[PDB]
Amino acid sequence: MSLQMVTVGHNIALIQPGFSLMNFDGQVFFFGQKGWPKRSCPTGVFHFDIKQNHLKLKPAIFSKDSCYLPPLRYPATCSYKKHQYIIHGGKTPNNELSDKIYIMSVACKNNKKVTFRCTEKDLVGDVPEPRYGHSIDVVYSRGKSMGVLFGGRSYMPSTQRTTEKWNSVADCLPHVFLIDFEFGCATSYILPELQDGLSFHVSIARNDTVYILGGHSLASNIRPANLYRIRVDLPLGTPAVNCTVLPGGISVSSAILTQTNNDEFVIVGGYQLENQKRMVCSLVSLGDNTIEISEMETPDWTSDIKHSKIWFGSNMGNGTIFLGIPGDNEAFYFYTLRCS
Amino acid sequence: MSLQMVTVGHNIALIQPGFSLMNFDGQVFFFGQKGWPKRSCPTGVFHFDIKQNHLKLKPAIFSKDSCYLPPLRYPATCSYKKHQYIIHGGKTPNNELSDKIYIMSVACKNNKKVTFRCTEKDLVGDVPEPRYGHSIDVVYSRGKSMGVLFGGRSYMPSTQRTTEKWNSVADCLPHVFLIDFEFGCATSYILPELQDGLSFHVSIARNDTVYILGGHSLASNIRPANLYRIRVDLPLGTPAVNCTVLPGGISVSSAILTQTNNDEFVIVGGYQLENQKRMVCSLVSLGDNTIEISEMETPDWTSDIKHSKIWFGSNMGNGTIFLGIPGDNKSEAFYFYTLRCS
Amino acid sequence: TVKAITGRQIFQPLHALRNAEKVLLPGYHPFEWQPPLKNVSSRTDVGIIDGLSGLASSVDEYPVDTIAKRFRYDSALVSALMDMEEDILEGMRSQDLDDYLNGPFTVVVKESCDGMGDVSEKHGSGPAVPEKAVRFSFTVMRITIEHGSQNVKVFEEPKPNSELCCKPLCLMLADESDHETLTAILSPLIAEREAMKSSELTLEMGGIPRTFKFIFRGTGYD
Amino acid sequence: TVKAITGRQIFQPLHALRNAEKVLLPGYHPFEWQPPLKNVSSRTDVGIIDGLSGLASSVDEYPVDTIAKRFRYDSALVSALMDMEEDILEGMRSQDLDDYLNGPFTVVVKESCDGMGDVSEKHGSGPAVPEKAVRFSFTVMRITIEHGSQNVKVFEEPKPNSELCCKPLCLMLADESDHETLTAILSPLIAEREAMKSSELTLEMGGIPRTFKFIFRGTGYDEKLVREVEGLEASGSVYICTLCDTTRLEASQNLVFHSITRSHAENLQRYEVWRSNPYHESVEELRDRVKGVSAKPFIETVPSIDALHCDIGNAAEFYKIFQLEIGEVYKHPNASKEERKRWQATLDKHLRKRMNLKPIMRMNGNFARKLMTQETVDAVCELIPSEERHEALRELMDLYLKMKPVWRSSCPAKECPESLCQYSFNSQRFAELLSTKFKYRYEGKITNYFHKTLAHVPEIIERDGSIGAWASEGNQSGNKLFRRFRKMNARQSKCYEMEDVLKHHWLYTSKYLQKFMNAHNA
DNA sequence: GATCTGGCCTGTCTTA
């Protein structure tokens, strides 16, 4: 709980609301820059570096058998354990919602010179509709890793999408998918407890139960104060799921989740109401089948933040939050936040 | 016979056409800036110094008993022998003409610092009307000095001056005026060989004679190639003035006069016709009573002067000539070239 | 002043002109495409609509701070054809044809676009508008009928680069380098263009239905 | 179009209008001065006289790179008076005065001069003219007649700040700081002005020869041009006020008691002392004696205050005070530039989100008027953590709003007499507030317009009558018309645009036509 | 041979 300014270099324009700070062995990496990649970095993947409260951005290349992916703006990022990440969904700079899974993995490194491997993976069966503002998590159950995906929001289907409302977006159907990363099979499930869709939520992952918290519903235009839980099982045959509501929910839209300690997740403010900005932070501590929430001691916020209307950011991995404030007319003031 | 590029400092705007450089024991001093004197220098007189072909200006102060003079754009400079100069006529920053006469001098010197004594001098008798673009010289006749004034333009008289032709100029009368520096008195002398008013000419002086070269005449719009020999004499009574026309004239207006050595001057610049700017030089020779105007080598002019339209400058004293040309504007307003001839 | 001095109504009041304007503006004349337009409605009374095309403006999603106004392409072309009916009829009469002909016409167009800098911003309420501007226009070039066994032109533009024939279509205040906003604004127009590149129009000229098919060409791009 | 469609002529052709224009333009009505004008021709048919006034343009003479056009001053006055015949007649008829009276009317005229900028140069042949443009205009303000032992106000302009009554006089293309060309062009105008300032005009309108006497006033001059023409240094000097001769420190100490002793002949005397130096003093002693005069004056101006620039300066100063208040400078006398940048950005964003305003480079006019509200003080106090600062700013803005209507109304003695009667106390409390609870900024320094507002406003109000009806904002409004006319209503040639723009802007400010457009109101 | 002086610069404020 300590704020600090950040002096960025020259390429501040390459940062936009909706980026993703992927982490690989302490080396935080950038993704999702504004516009198509120029000739300074045809890959669009940058190596984050903060020293003496100063920020620098340098390019990075891929392997000889990689796939140059377009820079997305709202993907679903999740860790995996061979440490690699999963990218799904997103919004291309041409507003074309991608429905293809990309996998990041470091394949070579020598004196601060890395080389990624962006493989390509499609899906079969109950493939998800291309969307954004959603989340995906991995689940370990009985010596097996399975990916759980939750619905988000997307454009109108190819039938009712009229030109007068070509950019209208509604919440997707609240289903639950199981994606096998080894094979690429996605199976569609239906849960009676999940009544309506949800987007921009927070998905907390653990051994075998995913914790959904907060979000925003576009249909009813309401920010619920509920928290959900999805336990699953991986028997020798067909899987099994579950979902039950829980008391003590939190109403947050587009939060930023990070990890302070093992089984001790802290969360920062998001959006409380439409024109009201969340300020106080919460703390999530888990047991075995329990939860815990508590209003922490809010950090000393600056005057510019106490009146800014829009703010964004993401996680850094090392218990640190990188958020930004829009300027005027240089264009984005960037602050950092450390937890414990 | 060399032409050199000159780099100027920050206040290049303080130089305008019509200035008058003054020399004092190897030190050239600038005068006649643009506009009223600002707070960077409450006097206007600046120190002229060129080091490694670079130009830098330096302000200067006056003495206690001085008289703060306004800038003048077309005075009548004249050397004198302690050492001192004479300033007469010119155009005030308010486009008005000044009939007053000034006597600059040196008051003190300590570590390259010079103090002046600007003293206004009263003129009584046949005072001339306020003029500009003329010349004045000093003649020596039997251990006595006397100032010779001739030429100059001026506005219309007080009666005929109308606000529809408020800026119309007319050549003054060809009268010759002897100015006495001791009593501060003048006297009007008329000459029969003088019929057309002349302006922007060149006055070459000698022991007791002064010579006239070129100029312009508004009454006829002609640049005559005249050569007048005025021999002022100072007897124990009333002075004597005589004129004489001589062959071998030059058709030039607003030329630059410099002194490489005694009894020989160098003339460069000016104009032959309205749009035909003079390019060739001219060498004179002052004998006992004769004069010989001849051609010399033509210095290598760059591509800027050959296709320019106007230029200005004055003498520096050490056989060098300060020359400037109009630059661009959006950039540097002017360029400046020094010329060497010795 | 004219009515006060003379005492006779030589000109009509402002409301008469405001009422007469509704005849020339698009979304007034009925029409119908042969093969129904894909992803396009059938309302023939669609005038000036918001250029954002229903883009979300919530604080949660990608912040948008640009305003836009535009017509609908097909209605724009219908209004353009209604505007130049007399010229088409005169061209048909000149080439020794019949006025009651309804053969499939061919209309080629020329699209254009450019970014405009130095467009000051006003005070007041609303989103933060950037100090730029981007336009989008089109222009018909030559109308051709297929008579007999070959083709012949009916109406070609005499002054191709004249401002008097540059029909505006879309207007917005955004940077020409803001690729995201630019695509978000121009994607509906491109979708309409793609849908219209494989259809035919039925239109009434002088009381007789006519057939139209288009050939799009975009060259006015630096 | 109308003639071809309607088959008749509702309108007249162009040549008829051209022929009719020659009546409103100067040089068409006879007149004569009973005292002959010195150095001014008595001919009465001159039109657009060249601006250069026959300046020598030879190659040997000082170079000329400017063009100018203008009228004769007296002919312009005659034309302006003949344009307002009906108004004067109706004023005499309404004030219970016989129309055939020919008393010695008195006319007061307001002059103005401003230097424009960013005027694009054109191609073609001619002299290389600069881009800065300068104009000079006048305005007939009020007229009285001496009936018995009184002075009946027969006519007063109802809108002394409208562009519809600012009649042009001269145009040129030169820098305002270029002191040579400026004087070379403005010398004949000042000459004619000083000449006719000692005569009387007679002419016959309505079949009766009348009598006129002029009393000119020069107030439409911004502070910079006042410093220039009156023979003063720049504004950043220590002698700040052009009405009183106090220094910076003495104006930052007293703030209250300052009379005015600064006439036009006094400047000439000051310059003569500075030139002759009769007491053979040093630089500093002689400068203190002359109170900072180093240039011969050439224009007789009225020692007044420009209301528009005063409002702009006050708004800018206040804005800076808000910036300093937000940053808590009184608590931390040290601050980096980046802190200043962030403070200004925060203030701009807050004013944008709470006052519907946008960031601007230079202080505007509408931004000034709209920034000076109680709700603005509230929005600014929404950022200050302290609470006494809040009340301080509240009292500051209250005093300023209490002092504002004095120097902004067309007649304070008849609209807001309470503010005028209570102006001295309010000004003293304002100065005391600044001195006590604003020491971090106003310790030993004060700008021009605070001194002007806190020192000389009551005296100017009680002497000249009103402030605001004598501002320079009319010339600024006319600058717009000049731009539009030069862009769309003139010959696109380098040696033909000036006379066309001058003629068109003269015709646009003729009340004779303004009466035809108001027919609906009959 | 440190020790002030002079001038050179340099950021800030004041009108536009």
Ligand SMILES: [Ca+2]
């Ligand atoms: Ca362009």
Ligand SMILES: [Ca+2]
């Ligand atoms: Ca101006």
Ligand SMILES: [Zn+2]
């Ligand atoms: Zn004062």
